[PDB]
Amino acid sequence: SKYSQDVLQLLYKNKPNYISGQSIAESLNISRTAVKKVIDQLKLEGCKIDSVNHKGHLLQQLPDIWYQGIIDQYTKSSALFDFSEVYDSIDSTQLAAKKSLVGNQSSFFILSDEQTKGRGRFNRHWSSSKGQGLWMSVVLRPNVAFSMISKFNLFIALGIRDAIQHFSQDEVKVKWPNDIYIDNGKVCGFLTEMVANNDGIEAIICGIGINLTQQLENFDESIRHRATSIQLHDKNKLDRYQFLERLLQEIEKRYNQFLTLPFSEIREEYIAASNIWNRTLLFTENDKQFKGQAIDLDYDGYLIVRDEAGESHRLISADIDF
C-alpha cells in the first residue's frame, strides 16, 4: 500500500528495539488497524517481523526484494550519495542512470530487482534474473580529466572484489579490466562509462552486476558453465542488504583512494588479486583474434602483453577469454 515503505523504514530505523502498532500509527497518522494490514502484507512478501503482544514489532529479516524505504536509510547516512531509486523491474539501471544524471550534479545509485534489457560491454546481453543478483548503476562526480576513466575503473575493481571476498569461502579474483571470478565462475561484471568533454568529466556511471543467489540451474545453458554466484561459495544464507552495505562501503573507500592515490599505490595489490597470469589468453580486437600472455600491469594501468608471435603490446583495455 501507500504506507508499506514508511512502516518498513520505521521498523529498520528502530532496530534492535520493538515499536508498537500504536506508535507506528501515530507516526504516519493512520489507524492501528491499517498498521496491522500493512504488517500482514510485509510478512506475506517474506519480511520476518517479530510481533509481541504489549511490546510491538521488530524487523528480523528482509526478503530478496529491494525496498525504497530501507535504501532511503542507506542514503540518509551516506557521505557520498544524494539519493537512490529502486525498481522491481526496469530496462536497465544503466539507461536509467544515464537519463537521471542529465541537468544536475547529484551522485546517486539505481538498483533494480530485475532488468529486461541488461547490457554489458559491446552491447552484450547481461542476464539479470529477478531476485538473484545486485543490478546496480552508480553515478559519481569526480572533478578530473576525461583520461581518468581507466584509472577509476582499476580502483573500483578492488572495491568490488573486497566486498565479494568478505562473503565467499573461496578465492575471488579480478579479470582485468572488467570481470570478477570465484574459481572458473564469473560472479560479476562491471563497466565504467563517462559523460565528458575536453574540460573534464561531467559524470562517471559505473554499472555493476553481481550474481548473488542463482543456483547453477538458474543460469541460462549458454553461460551456465562459466557462471557462478556468491551463494554457491557461502555456507550461510547471503543477505542482500548486508551485501549492499559492505559494497557501498568499499565503493566509497576505493573512490577516495581513486581521488587521492596514483595507480602505483594499489598496483601490487591489483596484481595479487588478478587471475590473468601464467596462462594463455584469447584477445578479441574487432576482426582479429590472437593468443597472448599477460606480462605485467604498468604504473599507468596498461596491460603488457606478449602475444603468440613474440610481439609486445601495451593495452588500455581488452576483452580477454581464457
Ligand X SMILES: Nc1ncnc2c1ncn2CCCCn1cc(CCCCC[C@@H]2SC[C@@H]3NC(=O)N[C@@H]32)nn1
Residues of this chain that interact with its own copies (CB under 8 A) are 91-92, 95, 98-99, 102-103, 121-122, 146-147, 149-150, 153, 177, 191-199, 202, 316-317
List Cβ neighbours of 283 (8 Å cut-off, separation of 6 or more): 289, 290, 291, 292, 305, 307, 318, 319, 320
Q: How far is the first Cα of the chain from the last one, in angstroms, to the nearest whole number? A: 49
- Residues of span 202-221 touching ligand X by CB under 6 A: 207-209, 211
Number of residues that bind ligand X (CB under 6 A): 27
| Binding flag, residue 225, ligand X (CB under 6 A) | no
H-type helices in the chain, by residue range?
Answer: 4-14, 21-27, 32-44, 68-76, 93-100, 149-165, 240-260, 267-271
Residue 192 near ligand X by CB under 6 A = no
Q: What is the DSSP letter of 213?
A: S
Q: How far is the CB of 302 from ligand X (least distance, A)?
A: 19
Instruction: Please list the residues that pair with 186 across neighbouring strands.
Output: 181, 227
283 binds, among its own copies, ligand X, none (CB under 5 to 8 A by kind): none
Of the candidate residues 36, 121, 141, 224, the single one contacting ligand X (CB under 6 A): 121
Residue 191 found at the interface with ligand X (CB under 6 A): yes
Binder among 115, 165, 192, 275 for ligand X (CB under 6 A): 115
189 in contact with ligand X (CB under 6 A): yes
Q: Closer to its own copies at the Cβ: 85 or 183?
A: 85
Closest to its own copies by CB, 100 or 165 = 100
CB of 11 to ligand X, least distance (A): 28
Torsion sign (Cα): 214, 218, 220, 223: positive
Residue 71 and residue 221: Cα distance in Å, rounded?
33
Least Cα distance to 70 among 54, 84, 58 occurs for 84
Find, among 21, 25, 67, 18, the residue nearest to 42 by Cα.
67
Residues engaged in binding ligand X (CB under 6 A): 92-94, 115, 118-121, 124-127, 135-137, 178-179, 186, 189-191, 207-209, 211, 223, 227
